[model samples]
Target: SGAIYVGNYRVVNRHLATHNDWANLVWEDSSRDLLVSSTTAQGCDTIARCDCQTGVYYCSSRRKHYPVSFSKPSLIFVEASEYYPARYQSHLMLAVGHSEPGDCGGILRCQHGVVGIVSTGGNGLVGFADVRDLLWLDE
Candidate 1:
């Protein structure tokens, strides 16, 4: 399966040499829905924001680790009324380890249901893709 590369140790090392903290990754879906990931020391927090119209992934991260007192939650801007431009939606995924090693797992979803996965660690890429089955289901 094709996978998107978000972060690596080498990139993280270079990032650490320059800054104290890193920012998380954020990407957009085909519907222009935005998705963000947590930050990391060695390029872990880097997020890849995808622009559906342009088909590009933009990367960014935090300058420093977020405080523990404040939960650094990842967000998604879903279209809705009453709560227009709602920053926090029920579908948004709250991930742990926004500022610690061996602590990088979060939730995501598709047509299936709520899906949780880790951005870093041995697991692999962290994001969602439309599978053939899902596309077929839409039809």
Candidate 2:
């Protein structure tokens, strides 16, 4: 509740499942979209944050601490089940090897819901967070 800075841009839409020849990253580029999710096939828990002024997103999953950018300048994209039937999972949960938000390890928080855009205070653009996903709040 410090400032309303959402970020540099807002997420218009998201898609899925862009595989690689030999990729094992915790976070991957959305191919001009916002963020294309991958399981990392490890055991890492996922938590992400977006820059308050650049629309740049970052992943804190499994200590990957990766940053992502978009290729399209429109700042808008859409994922339709009409196009890809298997767009549900899109390699988002297979990642393993990361610890849980138990008492010993620690915790992280991801923002839920779309709460940015508008020529208001500081909240310009924040990344997307799923309402179905798990979140860990500190204190």
Candidate 3:
């Protein structure tokens, strides 16, 4: 089982490696694409764009791609305690990522679907290797 450490929390994705990274800004574009982000040992973070048409993942920062080949495209994760609504969606987005912002580091605040480590603190931030695929899981 592989996992992405978000601060102290974790998002288990088959496409990424367990390492240090985090996501920044995010956007869930319809049901086929959700723009993802990540960082490296140094700064210069990357925004992984998921091409729904081809099932390919490309990084705007690195100019490279991997695969969303594993499965789905868009993901929706909500906190168990929190009800399903648009209000909590934003909360789940901010709860992760712990590199520069580091504000939400190690905070367990959500449940369900795709989650990526944007630049914000936790060494568990790097969910994927770099730029890969955006998966869609109907859980």
TM-score, one value per model: 0.18, 0.19, 0.19
Q: Per-residue lDDT of 1-139 in model 1, one digit per residue for the tens?
A: 1121233321111111222222443322323222323334333222323212111111122222221111123344433433134333322222232322223232222233322222221222222221112121111
What is the lDDT for 67 in model 3?
37
| Model 3: per-residue Cα lDDT over 1-139, one tens digit each | 2233322233332223233323432223212112323433233223234432222322333344433322222233432322123312221122222232222111121123223433122342312222234332210
Best by TM-score: 3
Ranking by TM-score: 3, 2, 1
Query: Which regions in candidate 2 have their CA more than 4 angstroms from the true location?
Result: 1-5, 15-80, 87-139
lDDT of 2 by residue, 32-139 (tens): 322322332332222343322222222233334322221212222323444333222221211112322111111213243222211100122223322122122100
Candidate 3 segments whose C-alpha is farther than 4 A from its true place: 1-54, 73-75, 78-139
Report every candidate's CA lDDT. 0.25, 0.24, 0.27
lDDT accuracy of residue 5 in candidate 1: 23
> Whole-model lDDT for model 3 versus the true structure?
0.27
lDDT: worst 10-residue window of model 2: 113-122
- Alpha-carbon deviation at 27 in model 1, angstroms: 15
Q: What number of backbone clashes does candidate 2 have, counting pairs of residues 3 or more apart or in separate chains? A: 19
Whose lDDT is greatest here? Answer: 3
State how far residue 81 of model 1 sits from its true place (Å).
16
